[PDB]
């Protein structure tokens, strides 16, 4: 659950290392295609909030400040429309 | 400093040595000697340690996403 209220600092370090290796060993278009499927949308809602836009801004800035970008373009589109 | 720079680039040439008869004579020599050898050898270890591939020009094809922050 990507939220600064719940997760500790080591949890963000763990998620950063995990997603950096996931973006490394398989491609960012393939990572976006894996995260963008309709079947696993209830399984990514704690990771990709799209609700309470302070938390959505935190998730967008988190995935940008890791060094990824890209994955949060749909979340940036959803934030910009609201 | 520009005049000294002109004399300095006039100094730094190849100038392959003349065969000199007799004993050799010491010519004009330096750098920062007191205490800078530690950071100099640290720079040597960093140069032996740092690994980076490709050309130096790699800033192209970067979307460069900025942080949204808060209003």
């Amino acid at each position: 659950k990507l939220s600064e209220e719940t997760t500790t600092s080591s949890s963000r370090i763990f998620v950063k290392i995990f997603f950096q290796e996931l973006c490394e060993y398989m491609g960012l278009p393939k990572l976006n295609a894996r995260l963008k499927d309709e079947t696993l949308q209830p399984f990514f809602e704690g990771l990709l909030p799209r609700d309470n836009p302070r938390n959505t801004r935190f998730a967008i800035n988190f995935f940008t400040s890791i060094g990824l970008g890209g994955l949060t373009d749909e979340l940036r589109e959803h934030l910009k429309n609201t | 400093a520009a005049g000294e720079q002109e004399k300095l680039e006039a100094t730094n040439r190849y100038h392959m040595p003349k065969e000199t008869r007799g004993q050799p004579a010491r010519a004009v020599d330096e750098s920062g000697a007191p205490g800078e050898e530690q950071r100099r050898w640290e720079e040597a270890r960093l140069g032996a340690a740092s690994l980076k591939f490709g050309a130096r020009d790699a800033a192209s094809q970067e979307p460069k996403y900025q942080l949204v922050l808060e209003e």
Binding site: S9, K16, N61, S65, I66 | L67
Partner: peptide, 28 residues
């Protein structure tokens, strides 16, 4: 060495510190 370990985790990869640095860059 728990205190030095929390010092290393506050000096870790730390996206929160990047948020703080970019917020002070944008504010000032």
């Amino acid at each position: 060495d728990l205190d030095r370990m929390l010092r290393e985790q506050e000096r870790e990869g730390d996206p929160m510190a990047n948020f703080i640095k970019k917020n002070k860059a944008k504010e000032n």
